[PDB]
Structure formats: structure tokens, C-alpha cells
């Protein structure tokens, strides 16, 4: 890493350790939306890592961006997912497909972290098959009228701007809906296994009016925009999966060096030393795939294949590492006060969102036979 890249990570590391880490436990057991953490990050411009400085962001390179997400996830996976989403598709789509006026009033406040954004694609009946969503959008003189139900929306009810994907006569399109808008509604946050602080709920739209200017890019070419940003999002989630593995790993490594049983520190029993070594290898391999993808992105080359590979491997690595991390601490690994149990719960979901492991495999195979 260059001095510059390490300077950035020095800042990310500081906020992660000083703000995210100490607050993580309370926010997880209370399933409380992380406003203090986000604000702490916005002030550092970290909610705009994927956006150029001339749009309110800090425009980092993909490698530094990936390592930052890992650092944030290692401290609080919940805070990291929200970050990756608000500076994810919402800021990706506005930047590459939005108008100068849209970029001026929407991108800027997102990149600067004044607003939290959200992406709405998933529907109760359509998940992996986005290409078949049923949210409607009819042309009304003045704009459009949206009707539908979006599910599993990260930051729902908290985000100021929502990028809603709906269908029109011409096809699937992207819309920009602000909070407060008449008709827009939010269900109660879903109770889940992990990512407790990262609220996810339904975004309900009943006869919501959207101005002609709130339409994002070409009508009917929205799904294409979304998939365009998915490659990046996956590298981002892959990065997070590595962070989740690293966070649990560090606790296990330290523990095996302090804890003693049968007259030796745990690391002195081959079984345990081998678990610590396997964990490391999985993490190193996972990060290697993440950075390779990030570098390819920066070279302006197609990186769909490398993105799914990294997402797929890292999420599996995260689950596999955390399982052993808990194991190393014995009973204590099951205790909330030791954090590894929290990492174990969060790890599993990385195999589901941002494209399930099954879907990542379809994409990979498709790419291999292109």
C-alpha cells in the first residue's frame, strides 16, 4: 500500500476502533439503528468513498475502499452494511446515470452523508428473480404514480432517499422517492438472526406521485443500471465478509494465547493451532480475491466474474472462520460478552444478500462459458 492509501486506512481504523467497536454490543442487543456511528463516519466523508470529490465524496480507489469496508465490518457489520448500501447502488446509479440536477441535489447530500440512501428491488415474491418484479409505475400527467411493496430494504424508514425499481409500459425503471412523500409507507423492522442494528423493513408505496424529474435515466433500462452496480456491490460485500472473519479471528488468536487448559496455552495443542492457521489461510485467500477484483475494477475492465468469485468465497470463508472462532473460546465463544458469537450470526447472511451463493454460481458459470 502507498503512503496515501495507508493514511486513509489510518483514519478508518481510528473511527472504527473508537466509535464503532465500543458501541457495537449495545446497538446489537438493542437492535438500535446506528445514528452516532454513521454521523461519526459522515464527518470523515466515509459515507461517500465511492463518489468523486466533485460530488461530495472522497473518491477513493477500489483497493482502499475495499479495505475500509473490511475495517468497518470488523468493528460493526451492521454499520458496514448500511454504509455499503447508502454509498452503494444509490450513489452508483446517480453518478453514472443521473442528470446534473439530480447529482447536484441527491448525490451530494448522500456522498457527504447528510442523507442515508436506500435501494428497493426485492419483493415478497421476487428476490433472486428481480427481472420479474411486479411493482407498477403508470404515466400520470406530470410524472408517475407508483404502487407496490418492496421487502428487505436496508435502512427503510431511516433513509431520506429511496431508489425504487418499478415497472412501466416500457419496462423496469428506476425512481427517486424522498421520505415524507404522500403514499410512501414503511413496515416494522424485521427481527432477524443478525445485523440487528441494520434495520430492514418493507417500503410500501400506495399511489405515490413521482415528478418527471425524479425518474432516473432511461425508462425501461433500470434493471440494467442495477446489475451494473451489482459487480461493485459484491466486491463490497465480499470485503465485509472478510472483515467479519477478521474480527472474529483476532479474538480467537488472542484467546488461544491467553487461555490455558491441560497445562498449556490453547495454541500449544495442535488441534487449536491448526484451526488458527486454517482461519488465517481462508482470510488471506478471501482478501486476495477481493483486492484482485478491486484492482480490475480500477482498470476499467469487466469484472463480473471476479466479483462473484470474491463474494462467494469470502462469504463462505466468513461462515467457516466464525464457526471455528467460537469453537476456540469454548463455552465463552457462545457468550455475548465475547463477540465471536455475534460474528457467527452475521457471517451467515453474507451468503444470502447481494446475490445468494447459488446465484453467484450461476453468474460465475455463465461468465466462464461466455
Which stretches of the chain bind its own copies, using CB under 8 A?
253, 257, 267, 270, 273-274, 276-278, 280-281, 284-286, 288-289, 292, 306, 309, 312-313, 358, 360-362, 364-365, 368-369
- Which candidate in 169, 320, 354, 367 is catalytic? 354
Annotate each residue in 142-171 with x if it binds ligand FAD (CB under 6 A) or - if it does not, as one string.
Answer: ----------xxx-----------------
Does the protein bind ligand FAD through residue 200 (CB under 6 A)? yes
Q: What is the DSSP string of 205-249?
A: EEEEEEEGGGEESSTT-HHHHHHHHHHHHHHHHHHHHHHHHHHHH
Cα(first)–Cα(last) distance of the chain, in Å?
34
349 touches ligand FAD (CB under 6 A)? yes
When CB distances are held under 5 to 8 angstroms depending on the partner's kind, the choice from its own copies, ligand FAD, none that residue 85 binds is ligand FAD
Strands 161-168 and 117-120: parallel
Of 184 and 363, the one with the shorter C-beta distance to its own copies is 363
Whether the Cβ atoms of residue 102 and residue 44 lie closer than 8 Å to each other? no
Compare residues 150 and 287 and give the one whose CB is closer to its own copies: 287
Q: By the 8 A CB rule, do 255 and 340 touch?
A: no
Q: Which is nearer to its own copies, 50 or 308 (CB)?
A: 308
Beta carbon nearer to ligand FAD, 44 or 228: 228
Residue 278 binding partner per list its own copies, ligand FAD, none, with a CB distance cut-off of 5 to 8 Å that depends on partner kind: its own copies
* Partner from ligand FAD, its own copies, none binding residue 257, C-beta < 5-8 Å depending on class: its own copies
Give the CA count within 13 Å in the CB-facing half-sphere of 45.
17
Active site residue 354: yes
Pairing of strands 200-211, 143-154: antiparallel
Q: How far is the CB of 12 from its own copies (least distance, A)?
A: 22
Judging by beta carbons within 10 Å of its beta carbon (0-12, 13-18, 19+), is residue 7 exposed, middle or buried? Answer: exposed
Contacts 24+ apart (CB under 8 A), 37-40: 37/76, 37/79, 38/79, 38/82, 38/83, 38/113, 38/116, 39/113, 40/15
- Check binding of 232 to ligand FAD (CB under 6 A): no
Residues 95-124 that bind ligand FAD (CB under 6 A): 119-122
Length of the chain counted residue by residue:
370
Q: How far is the CB of 366 from ligand FAD (least distance, A)?
A: 12
We find the least distance from the C-beta atom of residue 195 to ligand FAD, in angstroms, to be 5
C-alpha distances (whole Å) from 269 to each of 256, 257, 355 are: 9, 11, 39
Task: Find how far residue 68's CA is from the centre of its chain.
Answer: 12
Q: Does 78 bind ligand FAD (CB under 6 A)?
A: no
Q: Which residue has the cell 442515508?
A: 116
Q: Which residues are annotated as a binding site?
A: 119, 121-122, 128, 154, 270, 356, 358
Q: Name which of 119 and 338 has its Cβ closer to ligand FAD.
A: 119
141 in helix, strand or coil?
A: coil
Asked if 356 touches ligand FAD (CB under 6 A), the answer is yes
183 binds, among its own copies, ligand FAD, none (CB under 5 to 8 A by kind): none
Residues that bind ligand FAD (CB under 6 A): 85, 119-122, 127-128, 152-154, 195, 200, 349, 352-353, 356, 358-359
Amino acid at each position: 500500500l502507498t503512503q496515501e492509501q495507508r493514511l486513509v486506512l489510518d483514519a478508518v481504523r481510528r473511527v472504527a476502533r473508537e466509535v464503532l467497536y465500543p458501541l457495537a454490543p449495545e446497538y446489537d442487543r438493542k437492535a438500535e439503528y446506528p445514528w452516532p456511528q454513521l454521523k461519526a463516519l459522515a464527518e470523515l466523508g466515509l459515507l461517500g468513498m465511492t463518489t468523486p470529490e466533485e460530488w461530495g465524496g472522497v473518491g477513493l480507489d477500489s483497493v482502499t475502499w475495499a479495505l475500509a469496508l473490511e475495517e468497518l465490518a470488523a468493528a460493526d457489520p451492521s454499520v458496514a452494511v448500511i454504509v455499503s448500501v447508502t454509498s452503494g447502488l444509490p450513489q452508483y446509479m446517480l453518478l453514472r446515470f443521473g442528470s446534473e440536477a439530480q447529482k447536484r441535489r441527491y448525490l451530494v447530500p448522500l456522498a457527504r452523508g447528510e442523507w442515508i440512501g436506500a435501494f428497493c428491488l426485492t419483493e415478497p415474491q421476487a428476490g433472486s428473480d428481480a427481472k420479474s418484479l411486479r411493482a407498477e409505475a403508470r404515466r400520470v400527467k406530470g410524472g408517475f404514480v407508483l404502487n407496490g411493496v418492496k421487502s428487505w430494504i436496508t435502512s427503510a424508514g431511516h433513509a431520506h432517499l429511496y431508489v425504487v425499481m418499478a415497472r412501466t409500459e416500457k419496462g423496469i425503471s428506476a425512481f427517486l422517492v424522498e421520505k415524507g412523500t404522500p403514499g410512501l409507507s414503511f413496515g416494522r423492522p424485521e427481527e432477524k438472526m443478525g445485523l440487528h442494528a441494520a434495520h430492514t423493513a418493507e417500503v410500501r408505496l400506495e399511489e405515490v406521485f413521482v415528478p418527471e424529474e425524479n425518474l432516473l435515466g432511461e425508462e425501461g433500462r433500470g434493471l440494467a443500471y442495477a446489475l451494473a452496480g451489482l459487480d461493485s456491490g459484491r466486491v463490497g460485500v465480499a470485503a465485509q465478509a472478510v472483515g467479519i472473519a477478521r474480527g472474529a479471528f483476532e479474538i480467537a488468536k488472542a484467546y488461544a494465547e491467553e487461555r490455558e487448559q491441560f497445562g498449556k496455552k490453547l495454541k500449544e495443542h495442535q488441534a487449536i493451532a491448526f484451526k488458527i492457521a486454517d482461519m488465517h489461510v481462508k482470510i488471506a485467500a478471501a482478501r486476495a480475491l477481493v483486492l484482485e477484483a478491486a484492482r480490475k475494477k480500477d482498470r476499467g475492465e469487466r469484472f463480473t466474474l471476479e466479483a462473484s468469485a470474491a463474494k462467494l468465497f469470502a462469504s463462505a470463508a466468513a461462515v467457516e472462520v466464525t464457526r471455528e472462532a467460537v469453537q476456540v473460546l469454548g463455552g465463552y465463544g457462545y457468550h455475548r460478552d465475547y463477540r465471536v458469537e455475534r460474528y457467527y450470526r452475521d457471517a451467515k447472511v453474507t451468503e444470502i444478500y447481494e446475490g445468494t451463493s447459488e446465484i453467484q454460481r450461476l453468474v460465475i458459470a455463465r461468465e466462464l462459458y461466455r
